[PDB]
């Protein structure tokens, strides 16, 4: 008796008309996936000379 159907994937809920659609159909965590910086090995070896 899913008169809710699935608003995503193109199906329409029964309460909603042909024109309108559900305002919000998902939840957003607002926490992003990020990757760490690559580590360096050759840099600590170098010895600096002033110019």
């Amino acid at each position: 008796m899913l008169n809710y159907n699935a608003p995503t994937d193109g199906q329409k809920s029964s309460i909603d008309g042909a024109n309108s659609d559900q305002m919000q159909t998902f939840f957003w965590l607002k926490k992003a996936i990020i990757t760490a910086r690559k580590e360096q090995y050759f840099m600590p070896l170098a010895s600096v000379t002033n110019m």
Partner: protein, 50 residues
Amino acid sequence: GAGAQATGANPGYRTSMVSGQEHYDVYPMLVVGDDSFTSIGFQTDGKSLK
């Protein structure tokens, strides 16, 4: 692609295609000794890069 051309007799080594023909790769496998090189620092306040 620095290596020689790889035919169908490849036993499983890595190859890269250069100008439409596959060629073998070359890998550095490096050794760095003491006091071999130094870094020139320009307005760097004693660090390698700013």
